[PDB]
């Protein structure tokens, strides 16, 4: 009867990550399934610098994040890990879009997790992914 109202702001596609190139899909997927069962109130997240970003790199890519943590809290966390200056910008991208700062990480996971059961976030100094 009714139409599915496809959102005007629908995401882009998945993004390339060095992490996905360096860890075979079936190994990631098996790990993701297991970590979701072990910590069901947390979400597994891979965080990587976007292509062409001019910003410090993380020493750790893998984060197990409480599902109620907001995207804003996760920005605050990442800023501190790379000692961003007060005047430095930080943008996240999931499936090519900037996620809402007020979303929870659990909400982002539900909408954007990939087939390996991970959520992938790219970060940048720029507001356009890959620029």
Author numbering: -13 to 117
Paper text:
Mammalian ATG8 proteins comprise two subfamilies, namely LC3s (LC3A, LC3B, and LC3C) and GABARAPs (GABARAP, GABARAP-L1, and GABARAP-L2). ATG8 proteins promote autophagosome formation, elongation, and closure, as well as fusion with lysosomes. The canonical LIR motif is a small Θ0-X1-X2-Γ3 motif, where Θ represents an aromatic residue (W/F/Y) and Γ an aliphatic residue (L/V/I) (whose side chains bind to hydrophobic pocket 1 (HP1) and HP2 of the LIR docking site (LDS), respectively) and X represents any amino acid (aa). In this study, we examined the molecular determinants that regulate selective binding of the centriolar satellite (CS) marker protein PCM1 (pericentriolar material 1) and the ULK1 complex to GABARAPs.
Our affinity measurements showed that the LIR motifs of ATG13 and ULK1 exhibited very strong binding affinities for GABARAP. In order to find out whether their C-terminal regions are contributing to GABARAP binding in a similar way as observed for PCM1, we determined the crystal structure of ATG13441–454 and ULK1354–366 LIR motifs bound to GABARAP at a resolution of 1.14 and 1.07 Å, respectively. The ATG13 and ULK1 LIR motifs interacted with GABARAP in a very similar way. In the N terminus, the main chain of the aspartate in position X−2 (D442ATG13 and D355ULK1) formed a hydrogen bond with K48GAB from HP1. Within the core LIR sequence (Θ0-X1-X2-Γ3) the interactions were completely identical: (1) the canonical LIR interactions previously described for PCM1 structure, (2) in position X1, a valine (V445ATG13, V358ULK1) was packed against the aromatic ring of Y49GAB, (3) in position X2, a methionine was engaged in a large surface of hydrophobic interactions with L50GAB/Y25GAB, (4) in position Γ3, the carbonyl of the hydrophobic residue formed two hydrogen bonds with the guanidinium group of R28GAB. F364ULK1 in position X7 formed an extended hydrophobic interaction with L55GAB, F62GAB, and L63GAB (similarly to L1961PCM1). This interaction was further stabilized by P365ULK1 in position X8, which was packed against F62GAB side chain and formed hydrophobic contacts with F364ULK1. Thus F364ULK1 was sandwiched between P365ULK1 and L55GAB/F62GAB/ L63GAB. A361ULK1, the corresponding X5 residue in the ULK1 LIR, made hydrophobic contact only with P52GAB. Strikingly, removal of the whole C terminus of the ULK1 LIR motif switched on binding to LC3A and LC3B, suggesting that the proline residue and/or the alanine residue in position X4,5 (P361ULK1 and A362ULK1) may inhibit LC3A and LC3B binding to the ULK1 LIR motif.
